[PDB]
Design a protein around this ligand. Sequence first.
Ligand SMILES: CC(C)CCC[C@@H](C)[C@H]1CC[C@H]2[C@@H]3CC=C4C[C@@H](OC(=O)CCC(=O)O)CC[C@]4(C)[C@H]3CC[C@]12C
Lengths: 147, 99
Amino acid sequence: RFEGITTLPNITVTDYPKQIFRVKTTQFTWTEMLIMVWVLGMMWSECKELWLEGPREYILQLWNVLDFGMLSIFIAAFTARFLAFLQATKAQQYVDSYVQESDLSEVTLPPEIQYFTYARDKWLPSDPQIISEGLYAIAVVLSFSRI
Amino acid sequence: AYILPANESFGPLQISLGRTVKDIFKFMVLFIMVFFAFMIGMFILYSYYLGAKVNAAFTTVEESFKTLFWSIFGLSEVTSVVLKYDHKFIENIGYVLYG
Ligand SMILES: CC(C)CCC[C@@H](C)[C@H]1CC[C@H]2[C@@H]3CC=C4C[C@@H](OC(=O)CCC(=O)O)CC[C@]4(C)[C@H]3CC[C@]12C
């Protein structure tokens, strides 16, 4: 995406027709899982030092508070992404299980389930993936401060 | 610069110029670090709204660099952050990060 996204936010592109677009959008790539286990390790180290020094002395240093907040925000972004992906894979399971057709676009689906076929523009303002993107941007901006 | 030091009026000026440049190079390095931080952050934030913004400010890497750099001299408008859609959370985070 360094030179810009290829498809417009209005268009939905999927690898195979039976799959739900949100499964394609919210799936974890390999580098993202590397970042995830990385954040888990950093959080383990920080919680170990918290348990050792104790919360009272741990909170005194403001930079340690900043680091704790950054790690928790990364965790929150990935949790919202995973909730979006759980709804995605559940709608995908419904579509693959109950309806039969060649292409999904021609089919009419139950509305609560059909919502997961919409493109970027139609998305509800409180979608968990939107929260994920925002918190992830904030977390990157804050993580660059560890220099 | 090869000619000015001969002038008693302009010599000391140019000497102080060399001095302050040598000094502020370090703060320029630190500002490069923080600027790259914010650039990558806002780029990752806004990259998906290529055709859903007022202008194309934070859509790509180079254009995000241009916008954020020109923001140093106040030559960048604040409408670059606004979105066309109703994703209020993303544009609020954009306001916060830019400020
Ligand atoms: C006004 C426009 C049309 C011309 C502007 C030219 C300046 C940008 C440059 C070109 C020639 C330069 C001058 C050429 C010779 C000298 C003499 C030099 O030495 C002295 O001050 C006299 C005592 C000594 O030489 O030891 C000091 C720099 C100065 C004024 C230079 C200063 C910078 C100058 C004026």
